[PDB]
Design a protein around this ligand. Structure first.
Ligand SMILES: CCCCCCCCCCCCCCCCCC(=O)OC[C@H](COP(=O)([O-])OCC(O)COP(=O)([O-])OC[C@@H](COC(=O)CCCCCCCCCCCCCCCCC)OC(=O)CCCCCCCCCCCCCCCCC)OC(=O)CCCCCCCCCCCCCCCCC
Ligand SMILES: CCCCCCCC/C=C\CCCCCCCC(=O)OC[C@H](COP(=O)(O)OCCN)OC(=O)CCCCCCC/C=C\CCCCCCCC
Ligand code: HEM
Ligand code: HEM
Lengths: 137, 378, 79, 106
């Protein structure tokens, strides 16, 4: 697909998505707010504010299935694995307790200082039987 | 940590049943052998509640079973489960064996040879203790089998009287045949415990004949459930036969109490020997005739090294599949012959089966496996 | 010493699969059971029957002939 | 022996290849050989672009039979493009056993 898409495809992409009010002008440091607003009004106001083509997509709440993929490739030295379930969204108030819960499992890599008796019950076992290179959440 | 892999007792059962690599195409036919195990525990168990009551008194034996199948609670059920639950343990054997002559299963020399011994022991316990319901069929088959082994030129005279305890059936015989039933059974179980030790270290088979170490799935959740399902399907047919039409597989001539004063008119054993009894009387020359009777369970050890094909199993051998179905039809005509009086064609015809059970797997099958080697260039 | 770690070596292959809880277990059983049997019975109806077919003939021949020479002996028992 | 009537014989060679059904499951002939200890060493001498093909053919043509279909008729391995890729690596292992044997004997 990165072998065919040409100038026309790109120019309407740039026209249909790059527009306000989908944009934010952010600044930090030693900036002054009034000066920033004055400078914004000069270079930006020549801008199309009314929606072009009225291309408003409708959000589809995501499906989530239970599948599994396996790729063999027997000549590599080490193996990678990942496992996951479904979670909340951005504005859901259930995020903070899940953060507090995932911080109890922890993380570990085979170059940490004081392994084999660090507080997590999973890190302290991998350090002493030597099963891991690393894991994370 | 993981208790399933460090305890001295559970290593043995995890490595043996729960976690062993198994193929994945196995036909149901790989099913039956387990069923035999179910039968083995049931023949032992049901069979002790009869030696509890039975009396090895030569003029007390027959009335014993007659009072048990009347007198006590539920004894009429147990008598018949014991008489019928071995009409089917002998059903299982002919399937578990015939398959190993389809899916090239004898190249397991160690597994195969600790088999035939078990065949001989199981086949002999049933005769050795179907003569102690103490009826006319029981005595008058005992006499006939006894008089053959006595035709050995120097062997015969001496051995025959040691099993009678005299000259003819008395208190001295029923006692030591009832000696026999108890012990062949326990000994047999230990030979079955060793059959499987060989099995670990080669793994099972698959109905194509090609080693598949590539894709082996466990034997938990899959083989465990398939097995339980089929097993609780053997208990439909067993119980329907016993509790609907029990009298179907027997004979009405272990009911007249044993006498030397009568003699049965059309003596013949139950169905599942009449095959290794139709060779016997098919031929004259008693000393020879006994030898041709055992040529059969030892015909079998002679058939791993007559193999002459390049591939394993009949699935890819469509011309040999013809000769395997003229073996079983042979063994069916040969069982129709036996349990029946002697007439004009019976002698001529039973003869052909005797000539052929040997010409099929002695000459034909090693010479018709090259005519097709020559066709695929091996 | 032949558990799930050490067996054959294979490379460059891939496989996919769902769960059981996101599927139904009867995908057109009625409308696919019959054609399989229709196509397979034909192939091996010819490979199990003809060997067995020559026993019906000999059994019926012997049965009826013996019945003759048992129920109709007084035919040739000439006076 | 005969040559003119051998054209008849070639015909039956096409018959047997259609009777045995290893083409129906997507295989070639040399995939169906019984591996005793002379064929366990002439497999360890294959180049690693022919070893991997034999693994993928067998693993696909063995899960068809636990599902009990076969493969579309256009996909059947045709008769004449079959390959004997293992005859040459095997008529050397046998030829060198026989030699250790005349040595010991005589
Ligand atoms: C306990 C008491 C012991 C007695 C038990 C009897 C045998 C039970 C058994 O183990 O058979 C398993 C077997 C289970 O089938 P499977 O798991 O799919 O594959 C095992 C076969 O060996 C694999 O066979 P297959 O699937 O490759 O196909 C072979 C078969 C076709 O096999 C089948 O497909 C049977 C299943 C069809 C569905 C039946 C639905 C009900 C009708 O066709 C034939 O070659 C037979 C000749 C033509 C007969 C046509 C009748 C077919 C119906 O049962 C049968 O094969 C049924 C037919 C055999 C009965 C013969 C009795 C004749 C009298
Ligand atoms: C004898 C007295 C005991 C009576 C027991 C009754 C025995 C009847 C057995 C019933 C089987 C007949 C119907 C089977 C159904 C059927 O034909 O399925 C076909 C099926 C096709 O299999 P595929 O792997 O797909 O091959 C490729 C096909 N393109 O064929 C088979 O599976 C054949 C399996 C062979 C089992 C043999 C059954 C017993 C025969 C014994 C032969 C003689 C044994 C001699 C031993 C005597 C001493 C014990
Ligand atoms: C492989 C195992 C066995 C087989 C195949 C077998 C077979 C038989 C058979 C066929 C009978 C005939 C019964 C009848 O016709 O009424 C019988 C009777 C008998 N068996 Fe077993 N048997 C086995 C194990 C045992 C064991 C283990 C015992 C005792 C420990 C035993 C004790 C008896 C007794 C006492 C009888 C006579 C009771 C009666 O006839 O009702 N059997 N056996
Ligand atoms: C009491 C008698 C017997 C018992 C309990 C018994 C039991 C078993 C069991 C449990 C298995 C493995 C499970 C399976 O393959 O399905 C097996 C396999 C086998 N048995 Fe027996 N068997 C008996 C008699 C015999 C006899 C008489 C023979 C005759 C040769 C025999 C030959 C074989 C063979 C070749 C296998 C290999 C199966 C395979 O292809 O993997 N067994 N038997």
């Amino acid at each position: 697909n990165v072998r065919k898409l040409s100038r026309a495809d790109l120019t309407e992409y740039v026209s249909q998505h790059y527009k306000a009010p989908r944009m934010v002008l952010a600044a930090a440091g030693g900036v002054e707010h009034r000066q920033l607003l004055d400078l914004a009004q000069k270079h930006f106001s020549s801008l199309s504010g009314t929606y072009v083509e009225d291309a408003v997509p409708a959000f589809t709440p995501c499906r989530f299935t239970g599948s599994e993929i396996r790729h063999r490739d027997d000549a590599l030295p080490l193996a990678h694995v990942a496992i996951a379930v479904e979670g909340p969204g951005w504005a859901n108030p259930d995020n903070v307790p899940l953060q507090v819960a995932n911080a109890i499992i922890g993380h570990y890599d085979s170059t940490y200082g004081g392994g084999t008796h660090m507080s997590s019950t999973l890190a302290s076992v991998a350090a002493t039987r030597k099963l891991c290179q690393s894991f994370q959440t | 940590t993981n208790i399933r892999k460090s305890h001295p007792l559970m290593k043995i059962i995890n490595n043996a049943f729960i976690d062993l690599p198994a193929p994945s195409n196995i036909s149901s036919w790989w099913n039956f052998g387990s069923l035999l195990g179910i039968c083995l525990i049931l023949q032992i168990l049901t069979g002790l509640f009869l030696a509890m009551h039975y009396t090895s008194d030569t003029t007390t034996a027959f009335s014993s079973v007659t009072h048990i199948c009347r007198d006590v609670n539920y004894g009429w059920v147990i008598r018949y489960l014991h008489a019928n639950g071995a009409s089917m343990f002998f059903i299982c054997l002919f399937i578990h064996v015939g398959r190993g002559l389809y899916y090239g299963s004898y190249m397991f020399l160690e597994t195969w040879n600790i088999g035939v011994v078990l065949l001989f022991t199981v086949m002999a316990t049933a005769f050795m203790g179907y003569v102690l319901p103490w009826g006319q069929m029981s005595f008058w088959g005992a006499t006939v089998i006894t008089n053959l082994l006595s035709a050995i030129p120097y062997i015969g005279t001496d051995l025959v009287e040691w099993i009678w305890g005299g000259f003819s059936v008395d208190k001295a015989t029923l006692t030591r045949f009832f000696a026999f039933h108890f012990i062949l059974p326990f000994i047999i179980t230990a030979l079955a415990a060793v059959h499987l030790l060989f099995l670990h270290e080669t793994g099972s088979n698959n109905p194509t004949g090609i080693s598949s170490d590539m894709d082996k799935i466990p034997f938990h959740p899959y083989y465990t459930i398939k097995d339980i399902l089929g097993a609780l399907f053997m208990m439909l047919i067993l119980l329907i036969l016993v509790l609907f039409s029990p009298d179907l597989l027997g004979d009405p001539d272990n009911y007249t109490p044993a006498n030397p004063l009568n003699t049965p008119p059309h003596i013949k054993p139950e169905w599942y020997f009449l095959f290794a009894y139709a060779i016997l009387r098919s031929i004259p020359n008693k000393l020879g005739g006994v030898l041709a009777l055992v040529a059969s369970i030892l015909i079998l050890i002679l058939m791993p090294m007559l193999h002459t094909s390049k591939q394993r199993s009949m699935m890819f051998r469509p011309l040999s599949q013809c000769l395997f179905w003229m073996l079983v039809a042979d063994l069916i005509t040969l069982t129709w012959i036996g349990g029946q009086p002697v007439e004009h064609p019976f002698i001529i015809i039973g003869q052909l089966a005797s000539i052929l059970y040997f010409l099929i797997i002695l000459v034909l099958m090693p010479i018709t496996s090259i005519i097709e080697n020559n066709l695929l260039k091996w | 010493g032949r558990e799930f770690g050490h067996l054959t070596r294979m490379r460059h292959v891939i496989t996919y699969s769902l769960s059981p809880f996101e599927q139904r277990a009867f995908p057109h059983y009625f409308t696919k059971g019959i054609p399989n049997v229709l196509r397979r019975t034909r192939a091996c109806i010819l490979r199990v029957a003809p060997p067995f077919v020559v026993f019906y003939l000999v059994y019926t021949w012997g049965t009826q002939e013996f019945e003759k020479s048992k129920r109709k002996n007084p035919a040739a028992y000439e006076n | 022996a005969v040559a003119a009537s051998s054209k008849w014989l070639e015909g039956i060679r096409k018959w047997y290849y259609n009777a045995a059904g290893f083409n129906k499951l997507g295989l070639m002939r040399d995939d169906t050989i019984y591996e005793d200890d002379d064929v366990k060493e002439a497999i360890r001498r294959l180049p690693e672009n022919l070893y991997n093909d034999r693994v993928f053919r067998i693993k696909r043509a063995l899960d068809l039979t636990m599902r009990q279909q076969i493969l579309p008729k256009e996909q059947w391995t045709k008769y004449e493009e079959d390959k004997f890729y293992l005859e040459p690596y095997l008529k050397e292992v046998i030829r060198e056993r026989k030699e250790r044997e005349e040595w010991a004997k005589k």
